[PDB]
Design a protein around this nucleic acid. Structure first.
Lengths: 237, 259
RNA sequence: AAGGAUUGUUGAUUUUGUGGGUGGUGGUGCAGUGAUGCCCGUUCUGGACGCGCGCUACAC
């Protein structure tokens, strides 16, 4: 065994040396060839030769042009069986449930600020607020352009301040209309929260600091109906 | 007849490419595509004797530099021939790793690749092993939808062959936004195998790779066909349905909405 | 973005952002074929000898 491996190691080294020797000769040939690069070209350019498509080729090119003109179809995924959909939706349930237990044991303008949104919705009726906010999301989706995530992300914070803002204002006149808007806005805020919790989270923590600061000076007077609403929304989201 | 000085130098190039594995390629080789008579200069370098490492690098060099029409000749006359030769001569009928890359580098240019590698192969007695190895290259690398749609459309018109079905399936499995006309072409292809006056395709025995391909089409383009077309495919399943795949296809077709 | 995204000079093959599936040139046993049972790459570089007498430290 000792003799065999030594022969094997010797054979491997021997072939390695040959490969290096072949490489050494190999590299030299390029250098000699490269040095003669100009002379070979001077003759070759002198001997350059003096100045129909397949029927298949004509068809293929014609197909590409015809294919460009017509419309393109949306491709759609396989329909999973109800047993598979149930199981996959069911499997997600333990995963989400189990994590919770472990945590338990330890044209359209996008307003970057709250005031900007009011100006856009200043002339609209109260019941139209869900319409305008939804369009802003549609007008500035992430895919449409670069940087839309940030614009939507900030708009998530703007939407939160608006829902608290409406609650502060008087609504006893049109409670039914007011009810139709807060829940509609809150549901939209829930959809936004799924993708932009970072921006909502930062806005949420700032409001807590603002709420505390106003409490230090004003006591119960700072507290408002929206403040109760604000705590409720956090539980929702 | 090239200059004798040129012939000797490029004969020295030929010997280099036999054993070349790494480093910089010879300068006289890197400049071949610029030459008008590259075919003659390429002949003296013995393309059949090119090492697998050379083929990958040469494929990089020529597809980038040559025009679409000339690179097609390079793909067809060299890359395709080397691709077939390696498979037939290998003990396990597998393709070398460096050649396997060269097909991808040729796929960099779709039109030249398709008419230089794909169509000549399927139209020149392609074998199943050739289709499988070639198909995976098309599966893994990105292609435009337009070029892929053109490639898919032609395959349908050709008479049914086992190699053609594999190439059609991978394109369907490639998950493209196929143009409506291409989907309509797909409808006719599968429709032509239904018994009616009809050709032998009605009675020709269908392998599963046809059924899997027809499953992929119904899987991916069920919402992309008209109601009348859907009925025709449903009739095709009833007449030529597979024992197990057939019921699955019927489920997918019936779950789709008309365009 | 063709009045030029990307390529080692080229031309829409790529680049940016947003969504997004798959172990798959797999192997192997069965009846080319099989919705098939079972599992799950490439090139270089290196590989104080023993015995033994005496003496000296180690113990609140």
């Amino acid at each position: 065994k000792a003799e065999v491996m030594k022969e094997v190691i010797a054979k491997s080294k021997f072939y390695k040396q040959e490969r290096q020797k072949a490489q050494g000769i190999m590299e030299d040939q390029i250098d000699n060839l490269d040095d003669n690069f100009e002379d070979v070209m001077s003759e070759l350019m002198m001997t350059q030769p003096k100045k129909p498509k397949t029927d298949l080729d004509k068809e293929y090119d014609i197909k590409v042009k015809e294919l460009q003109l017509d419309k393109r179809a949306a491709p759609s995924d396989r329909t999973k069986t109800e047993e598979e959909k149930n199981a996959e939706a069911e499997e997600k349930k333990r995963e989400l449930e189990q994590q919770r237990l472990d945590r338990m044991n330890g044209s359209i303008s996008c307003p970057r600020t709250h005031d900007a949104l009011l100006d856009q919705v200043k002339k609209l009726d109260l019941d139209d607020h869900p319409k305008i906010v939804k369009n802003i999301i549609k007008a500035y989706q992430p895919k449409l352009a670069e940087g839309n995530k940030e614009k939507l992300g900030k708009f998530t914070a703007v939407l939160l301040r608006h829902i608290i803002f409406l609650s502060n204002q008087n609504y006893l006149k049109n409670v039914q209309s007011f009810k139709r808007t807060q829940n509609a806005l809150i549901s939209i805020l829930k959809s936004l929260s799924e993708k932009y919790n970072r921006e909502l989270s930062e806005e949420c923590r700032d409001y807590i600091n603002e709420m505390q600061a106003r409490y230090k000076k004003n006591h119960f007077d700072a507290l408002s109906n929206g403040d109760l609403v604000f705590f409720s929304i956090i539980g929702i989201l | 007849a090239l200059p004798e000085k040129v012939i000797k130098a490029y004969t020295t190039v030929g010997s280099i490419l036999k054993t070349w594995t790494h480093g910089k390629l010879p300068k006289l080789f890197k400049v071949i595509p610029s030459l008008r008579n590259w075919q003659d200069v390429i002949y003296v370098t013995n393309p059949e004797e090119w090492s697998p490492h050379v083929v990958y690098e040469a494929t990089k060099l020529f597809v980038s530099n040559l025009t679409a029409k000339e690179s097609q000749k390079f793909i067809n006359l060299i890359l395709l021939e080397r691709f077939r030769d390696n498979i037939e001569t290998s003990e396990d009928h597998s393709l070398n790793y460096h050649i396997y890359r060269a097909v991808k580098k040729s796929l960099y240019k779709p039109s030249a690749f398709f008419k230089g590698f794909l169509f000549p192969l399927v139209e020149t007695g392609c074998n199943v092993r050739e289709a499988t190895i070639a198909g995976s290259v098309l599966a893994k690398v990105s292609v435009p939808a337009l070029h892929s749609s053109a490639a898919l459309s032609y395959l349908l018109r050709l008479p049914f062959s086992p190699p053609t079905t594999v190439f059609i399936k991978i394109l369907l499995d490639k998950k493209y936004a196929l143009p409506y006309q291409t989907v309509d072409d797909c409808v006719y292809y599968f429709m032509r195998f239904r018994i009616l006056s009809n050709g032998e395709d009605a009675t020709r025995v269908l392998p599963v790779i046809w059924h899997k391909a027809f499953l992929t089409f119904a899987q991916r383009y069920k919402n992309d066909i008209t109601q009348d077309q859907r009925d025709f495919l449903l009739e095709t399943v009833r007449q030529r349905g597979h024992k197990d795949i057939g019921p699955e296809i019927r489920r997918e077709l019936l779950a789709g909405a008309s365009r």
